[PDB]
Amino acid sequence: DKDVKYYTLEEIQKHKDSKSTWVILHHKVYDLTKFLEEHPGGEEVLREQAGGDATENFEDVGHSTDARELSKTYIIGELHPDDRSKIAKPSETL
């Protein structure tokens, strides 16, 4: 009973205060404003992203016992297709 709600890039970037913010993860939006105070133990959560090539080290371990990735119960919607390079030309993609 849920529908993916796409959010423009201006709305995902406008949220840059310090706590209430979201994070992209392979074409997707993660409203993790509560994740900051939901699992106190992993620092890479909403932190590992200084490079800017691909969010792969967003989370490894530190949940229950062998959780693959908590990234799933904190998503709000997906990324608008108007920004996804797949309409006129590829440019970034090849």
UniProtKB/Swiss-Prot annotation:
Heme binds at H39, H63. The keyword Secreted does not apply. Residues 4-80 form the Cytochrome b5 heme-binding domain. This is Cytochrome b5. The lineage of its organism: Eukaryota, Metazoa, Chordata, Craniata, Vertebrata. The gene is Cyb5a. GO terms for biological process: response to cadmium ion. The modification N6-acetyllysine is found at K2, K5, K14. Belongs to the cytochrome b5 family. GO terms for molecular function: electron transfer activity; enzyme binding; heme binding; metal ion binding. The chain holds residues 6 to 99 of 134 of the full protein. The keyword Transmembrane helix applies. Disulfide bonds: none annotated. It is found in: Endoplasmic reticulum membrane; Microsome membrane. Cytochrome b5 is a membrane-bound hemoprotein functioning as an electron carrier for several membrane-bound oxygenases. It is a single-pass membrane protein. GO terms for cellular component: endoplasmic reticulum; endoplasmic reticulum membrane; intracellular membrane-bounded organelle; membrane.
